[PDB]
Design a protein around this nucleic acid. Structure first.
Ligand code: TMP
Ligand code: TMP
Lengths: 318, 318
DNA sequence: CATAATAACAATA
DNA sequence: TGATATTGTTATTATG
DNA sequence: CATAATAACAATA
DNA sequence: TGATATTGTTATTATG
């Protein structure tokens, strides 16, 4: 197996961070680079294990989620440097207990949310704002609007979404479009990777397609197109966060802060409330419109956080 | 660790089967008994492994579910004979691949069902039948009725259910009772084991409680009380199956045969349709009324098989 | 004298 | 079923 | 001459 | 997160 290699992306991030006007020192990226460095020439399991042990000792005062993420970074770096067949990939990993605990906590949270939904009182107002954003000229705004109206992830919307009209009968669908470029998915049998599939929209198709075309033809939209996730995050995450904070501050449910993904949650809820066929379940429908894998009904549980004032009403009926 | 022991239950089942007027030969129970026999005196891992290998070779032309079940029987027998700390418990197990495949298939099935629900057209008729069964004098019938009206498992209903009135305000609840004696659960932190909890009923509480009291005071009901699962199965499973076949044959959804558990599914569906508070989800509610563990929302997915004609209607609205 | 900028830190799906 | 890819939030750094 | 009875076999949650 | 407890269905056996 390869004994030498370089994690190019890490080295490039580190190099670009040399001439920075301000900001944190890239200590983590540096530890990873030095890690991949020390790995060069290693042929003994125990040495590798000692190196990894050192790194694990380092990130001691961190959150479990944080440590798990960092381990992801290290593993991706090792994989980029030496390939998939390097023994370090068997060593550079967290306790099974850590992952089990993460799963546990996740389930507890989700179940807590299912036990006490948040009534989205002013949801129509939010949807309306998102629709007005489709007419805005600032591509950030068009983006937010498309998130609210299509329930696509930010990364998807800005950097890689392919929207096309959805053919209904022998014309075009008024309330659905064709989305391609699903994120967070590897190539596989039951995945939506590279799969163009029909999703519902919360306004006219023509509107969404027009706005998307505009955003996509904007200079900033051309900058966004094909971006990596890190590039997109560093480029836009805070601006998008602050903007979404600003737009929905007055009309968002008081139990939580306005977040971009909340538009995806709410999109799922509303789309189900308006378009769901009579023979599928809420989980199945969510899984369908969100682009989850086939036979995956467990991820849909993550998106059931709100209840509509109407449902709340005709449940109080009772 | 213990080198000798006896699987008493297996030996007793085998002994009682000696003087049988008819029926299959207990070949499996015999293989298990001979297994536990051969284990007596074994102190070498490789010997144990060879024995287990022999047994695995035996059940070769079986279904995966079957093999998994049999392995459960063997493991329970070993555990009963030698205790929890016997090395064989590390050997007597199936491939991880077998279990993974079982999980896979299960998820595929469940998702298929969520994709294509069965419209329970004549559900009110079924519920009515179940209500009439509460007035019947045959404790089998009272039992079926209580299954339909409380959504308790057969084993629970007949052998171990403790129903009491549910106090509403300062009177009694009309539409809910207190159930104790949840099955398929070990003692634990988030389990309903030994936990008395409030479940909804699909008729008046008084009715259900009266019928349950009658069934419980019947001679057959006194025979049922405290029975093991095997005893109950051999005593009643076929009669219950044939009877439920008979009662609902005309009015059951044409896509499937009338089965006892279908009353539990339908119970969950209807109970949600009638009593669900405005701030919980369908999964959470199911999990609540069915007695599933806290933070367990995945088992509830198993019970979403039907859709009501009404929901089908006001989904076609659309 | 103090803020924008950056990546660490962290949580979600 | 092994151990990721996104989104969300805070402490630290350089800069007339 | 043929059926009730039993446990194997199998699937579900 | 390791490897169960129920419910549902079929082949085999003993019996004037
Ligand atoms: C979608 C999803 C994925 N995962 C997976 C993705 C990673 O492959 C895995 C951790 O390794 O967790 C969850 O734990 N929860 C989820 O909701
Ligand atoms: C309730 C439930 C349990 N299980 C568990 C129970 C057993 O402990 C385990 C197999 O070992 O499977 C499922 O696989 N699916 C379910 O729906």
């Amino acid at each position: 197996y390869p004994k030498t290699g370089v994690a190019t992306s890490i080295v490039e991030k580190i190099e670009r961070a040399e001439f920075n006007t301000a900001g944190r020192k890239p200590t983590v990226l540096l530890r990873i680079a030095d890690f991949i460095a020390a790995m060069n020439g290693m042929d003994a399991k125990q040495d590798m294990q000692a190196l990894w042990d050192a790194e694990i000792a380092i990130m001691n005062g961190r959150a479990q989620t944080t440590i798990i993420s960092y381990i992801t970074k290290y593993r991706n770096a090792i994989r980029e440097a030496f390939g998939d067949d390097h023994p370090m990939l068997k060593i550079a990993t967290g306790d099974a207990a850590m992952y089990d605990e993460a799963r546990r906590v996740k389930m507890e949270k989700i179940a807590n949310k299912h036990g006490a939904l948040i009534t989205f009182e002013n949801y129509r107002q939010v949807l309306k704002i998102c629709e007005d954003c489709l007419k805005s000229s600032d591509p950030l705004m068009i983006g937010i609007g498309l998130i609210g109206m299509t329930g696509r992830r930010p990364y998807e919307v800005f950097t890689q979404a392919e929207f096309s009209p959805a053919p209904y009968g022998k014309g075009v669908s008024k309330w659905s479009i064709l989305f391609n470029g699903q994120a967070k998915t590897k190539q596989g049998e039951g995945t939506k990777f590279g799969i163009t599939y029909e999703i519902p929209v919360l306004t006219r198709s023509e509107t969404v397609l027009a706005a998307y075309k505009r955003l996509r033809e904007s200079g900033q939209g051309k900058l966004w197109h094909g971006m990596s996730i890190d590039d997109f995050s560093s480029e836009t995450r805070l601006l998008l966060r602050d903007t979404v904070f600003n737009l929905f501050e007055d009309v968002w449910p008081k139990e939580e802060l306005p977040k971009p993904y909340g538009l995806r949650h709410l999109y799922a809820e509303v789309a189900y409330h308006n378009f769901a066929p009579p023979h599928v379940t809420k989980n199945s429908y969510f899984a369908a419109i969100l682009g989850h894998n086939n036979n995956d009904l467990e991820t849909s549980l993550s998106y059931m956080t709100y209840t509509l004032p109407e449902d709340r009403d005709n449940a109080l009926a009772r």
